[PDB]
């Protein structure tokens, strides 16, 4: 399976940004495998508005951390086992009703309830950035250093049929 580097050297910007049409979304889940020895960094960021409608999934002290900021909730939460053990880990992030669910290696490790209304409704465009944020780290509810020295593979983001475009500030590097 082709795996890409989650950061390009300095690691101050995402390695890729995908834009989606929310009205066209039929699938809200995202999944991928990640491998790393890095205990802190951004795995992926998502927003409909960088100002007041955003989400971040990363690692802090080796464990998953989600920061979320929207009309219904504002939170900084850590959960799950350490993932900075150099092994491949399966990760899934999905919407289940008004909740955001995080599954690690097939097991649910965190369910953030009552945090969102329907995506398609309410913010017609959603952006997903890998390995970086779309705003300064200092703007996070709880700052961390975004650079994540790890590998990503077998990734699936939301609904491909709803993807408007994809960019890369530079060029994706292989973990081979």
Please, what is the minimum distance in Å from the beta carbon of residue 48 to ligand AON?
A: 5
User: Judged by CB under 5 A, does residue 50 bind Zn ion?
Assistant: no
Interface with a copy of itself by CB under 8 A: which range of 16-24, 83-91, 104-112, 130-138?
104-112
Please, what is the minimum distance in Å from the beta carbon of residue 147 to Ca ion?
A: 5
Let me know: does 48 contact 114? Beta carbons within 8 Å. no
User: Judged by CB under 6 A, does residue 47 bind ligand AON?
Assistant: yes
CA 9 from centroid of its chain's CA atoms: 19
Q: How many whole angstroms separate alpha carbon 35 and alpha carbon 169?
A: 22
Q: How many whole angstroms separate alpha carbon 145 and alpha carbon 116?
A: 27
Let me know: does 133 contact 17? Beta carbons within 8 Å. no
Pick from 75, 80, 32: nearest CA to 59 = 80
C-beta closer to Zn ion: residue 123 or 153: 123
C-beta closer to a copy of itself: residue 57 or 128: 57
Let me know: does 161 contact 24? Beta carbons within 8 Å. yes
Of residues 46, 58, 131, 150, which one binds ligand AON by CB under 6 A? 46
Please, what is the minimum distance in Å from the beta carbon of residue 52 to Zn ion?
A: 6
Interface with a copy of itself by CB under 8 A: which range of 32-40, 107-115, 152-160, 167-175?
107-115
Phi, psi for residue 172 in degrees, rounded to 5: -55, 130
C-beta closer to a copy of itself: residue 62 or 131: 62
Contacts of 130 (CB under 8 A, 6+ apart): 6, 14, 15, 16, 17, 43, 44, 152, 155
Which residues 70-109 are close enough to bind ligand AON by CB under 6 A? 70, 93-95, 100
Which residues 92-131 are close enough to bind Zn ion by CB under 5 A? 123
Of residues 31, 33, 53, 75, which one binds a copy of itself by CB under 8 A? 75
């Amino acid at each position: 399976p082709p795996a890409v580097h989650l950061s390009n050297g300095p690691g101050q910007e995402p390695i890729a940004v995908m834009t989606f049409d929310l009205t066209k979304i039929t699938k809200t889940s995202s999944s991928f495998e990640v491998r790393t020895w890095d205990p802190e960094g951004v795995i992926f960021y998502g927003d409909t508005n960088p100002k007041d409608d955003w989400f971040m999934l990363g690692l802090r002290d080796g464990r998953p951390e989600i920061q979320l900021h929207n009309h219904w909730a504002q939170l900084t939460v850590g959960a799950g086992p350490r993932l900075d053990d150099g092994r491949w880990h399966q990760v899934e992030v999905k919407m289940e009703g008004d909740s955001v669910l995080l599954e690690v290696d097939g097991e649910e490790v965190l369910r953030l309830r009552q945090v969102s209304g329907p995506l398609t409704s309410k913010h017609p465009i959603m952006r997903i950035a890998l390995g970086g944020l779309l705003f300064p780290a200092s703007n996070l509810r709880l700052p961390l250093v975004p650079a994540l020295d790890g590998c990503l593979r077998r990734d699936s983001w939301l609904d491909k049929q709803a993807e408007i475009s994809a960019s890369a500030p530079t060029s994706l590097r292989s973990c081979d």
